[PDB]
């Protein structure tokens, strides 16, 4: 609802439930569980028609979403470490894949 986040040509996806994600070791699983509220639960993207394939859409969706989230977070005086960005990358990629699938389907 109210996707047009113009912009700029970019659109804002609807909020998605946060998935349980396992990162493969004890320290990161705990870190993630505790910090995952700091990461986006919706993505910014350009219209799917503007991309050659899923990988291209997703790559850009990830970069744009993280960049925008990062500026809003820096405005609040907060900082993302390298672990934050690695974890953000992964979960935002999952959301962008879901967004693409929904956007790609929108052709009926």
């Amino acid at each position: 609802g109210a996707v047009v986040g113009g912009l700029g040509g970019y659109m804002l996806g609807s909020a998605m439930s946060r998935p349980m994600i396992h990162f493969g070791n004890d320290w990161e699983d705990r870190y993630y569980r505790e910090n995952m509220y700091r990461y986006p639960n919706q993505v910014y993207y350009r219209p799917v028609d503007q991309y050659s394939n899923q990988n291209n859409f997703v790559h850009d969706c990830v970069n744009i979403t993280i960049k925008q989230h990062t500026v809003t977070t820096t405005t609040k005086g907060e900082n993302f470490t390298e672990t934050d960005v690695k974890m953000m990358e992964r979960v935002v990629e999952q959301m962008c894949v879901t967004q693409y699938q929904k956007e790609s389907q929108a052709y009926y």
Partner: antibody
Amino acid sequence: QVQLQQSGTELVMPGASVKMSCKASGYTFTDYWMHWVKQRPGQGLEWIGSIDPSDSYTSHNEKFKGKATLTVDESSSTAYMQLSSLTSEDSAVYFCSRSGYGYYAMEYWGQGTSVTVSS
Amino acid sequence: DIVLTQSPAILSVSPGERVSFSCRASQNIGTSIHWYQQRTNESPRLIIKYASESISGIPSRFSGSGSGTDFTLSINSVESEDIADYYCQQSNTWPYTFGGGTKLELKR
């Protein structure tokens, strides 16, 4: 009962690649991380890399990044490791294993694929 | 990289005797150490997880203790099927690392 099925042996030419399979059964494939472990004859265990089948996120021993390609096929509940440019250093047994749910002891192990690199 | 040092490299034991071997980590890993038994030409098998937790179908004669950097696996009374190599492994942070192993042999 969980089973992890690996091919017994592979004979491969130096310089060639091999793709080894680990077929899982008896549980929900996407719920657990899969791991790959190398063992040279008469030597110890070495971690190669691990994969989350839910989204194919991976982590590698730095030494194997560029050498071991880890993938899964969700439809066949199968994890794969492809090793490229093989040398005699790659002659070894390769195990796949599966950890717990949000816990990382390696609970189940395949029988291992014995790779021999030779012309 | 967390280095796991196992000692001794070889342990000679008399059937029925109580034995212990040690795993020490170069950094604090809490309880994130797991122990594996590997008999000749077999796969490794998990025998104790998270320092001290027992595993279904593993004989109660196996136990572990420790927290931080110094860990011990003990066998209350060695059946001859316990003759094998024993490895510790940490899962606290990447990369996963393994100890160099302790070999059990029968004293004669």
